[model samples]
Target: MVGFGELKEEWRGEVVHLSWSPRAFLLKNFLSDEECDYIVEKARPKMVKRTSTGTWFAKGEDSVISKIEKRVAQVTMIPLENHEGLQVLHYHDGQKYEPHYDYFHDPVNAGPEHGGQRVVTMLMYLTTVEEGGETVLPNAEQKVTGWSECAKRGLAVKPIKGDALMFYSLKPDGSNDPASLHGSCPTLKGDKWSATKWIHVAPIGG
Candidate 1:
């Protein structure tokens, strides 16, 4: 397992170009093939269109189903007093999530809603694809190809199974990172599955 400190040191300079957004650390074989298949089997049945738009989620009311809150507490040193929950995403061939920031200002506030403010996001790649599905940050620099260039520029990442890509959606002063805005390129072939954990500073009633 690669330590976060190691990853931080390796990508320090390149990260600046990408607006200080941290590059994802590769968690090699975090889930075995058999284990991944098992989770996919159960999650696939529960898949539902994403509530936030332009994606899909394996819906469930129980936070335990997503397991992100527990996972975060276990893996990182960061103190998470209140965690919202996790949402799993599955993208079929040709599906894509357009470039967008997770949090928006003045986000149509209504009632006791927590304002859709996401603090940190962890996207765990459940399966690898055959072609054309890369997570990109266009604002960092002009388009680049392959992992070497991406690692050098800290701008994009190719899908790799059992890898978890994590980043803070908000800056230190509690403002959002505009340069962290990103999207998944269209899947040219094969299915893409990812589990996302959105951590919040507080809990939401709904």
Candidate 2:
């Protein structure tokens, strides 16, 4: 499964676009309008910023969320069981996540939760913002330059509803990619709603 089906289901993959990072796929309208609404409705109540720098994310216990997780697992070419619960994020006002890497710097191999390193990160945009609010890759720009559509325009993607971004943290040699470092820009206005399924190298939630 090199590609995730055809680009056109409706407003779907009509044309082939470009990925922005070492390994990434930006699929527009991946989620239906109603599905986005549903995720927001369920996650809104529990949404709260944990720290001043990062956004709020909740666990994926919802059945609907689980279904999406399964779909993401298939799309990312990772096993469904080797995954973590979907993380629903709520960003309002000026909340933003500073630059960071999703993969752990050190590996952990033992314990009750034996999940391994984060290899795939799928970011789904549930809502749009009037301005600002972009997933920026400060470190990966040069590395992804030759193949990125937005390379010249800066490695910043505007928050478009129903659009999802997926990127891999490891390289072909099965090693971590320093170029995978990225973060969300400040939320200038409206609600900056989103969700993520951080795929681990092994089964999670043991």
Candidate 3:
């Protein structure tokens, strides 16, 4: 069975390793265009706020979501029970999330009942932006150019429909991996729609 660090072509897509410090990779064609459209359509009516509006999907919420959840579990080799609900986020032009780590910092939040620490995050892009909306790992850098100012600062992965970015929040030793600090670049043109699935060390209660 192919595991998380395999970095090869799998049934779902091609896995390209982007960084080692925080263990990040890009999965091309993680979802199909039809699947992306379905997710957006399912989430559209619930997106009532502007700029970073979001909706949640329980585990196996629907046939499509169930398939996605099963695929994600297979790809990451993380049990489906360890994953929290899928979060669908929408960002209008100029909306962005600041750089931050996914792991919990507070003792209460890190409790086993709460799913302990967030160990991995799988972020899938549902729509392509016209200009910006790249996922920027601000703390890590590579020789890159011709990207947005925010993207230029670090290793940036452009948002493409059907693609997903996976990153580890804690190192192998179970400590926080500071190198995972990342944020979303402001959407310059078209709207940005993405889905995130966070995996925890333990099962989170419903």
Query: Each candidate's TM vs. the true structure?
Result: 0.68, 0.78, 0.90
lDDT of each: 0.55, 0.66, 0.83
**lDDT of candidate model 3 versus the reference:** 0.83
**Model 1 C-alpha lDDT per residue in residues 139-181, reported as the tens digit of each score:** 6534565443223343666677766667677676766667667
lDDT tens digits, residues 69-108, model 3? 7778778888777887789999977999988788766535
Residue-wise lDDT of candidate 2 within 1-206, one digit each (tens)?
A: 11122333223342224354557778777777788898888776766552332333333466566556656755666776566666777776677777778876654433336466788888889898776677877766543333223222336666788888888887766577877777777777767887787876767666
Ranking of models by lDDT:
3, 2, 1
Candidates 1 and 2: which is better by TM-score? 2
Which has the greatest lDDT? 3
Q: Which stretches of candidate 3 lie over 4 Å from their true place?
A: 1-10, 106-108, 141-143
Residue-pair clash count for candidate 2: 3
Q: What is the lDDT of residue 144 in candidate 2?
A: 34
Global CA lDDT of candidate 1, please? 0.55
Error of 2 at 82 (Å): 1.1
The stretch of ten residues in a row with the least summed lDDT in candidate 3 is: 1-10
Clashes of 1: 0
| Pairs with steric clashes in candidate 2 | 7-12, 7-13, 8-13
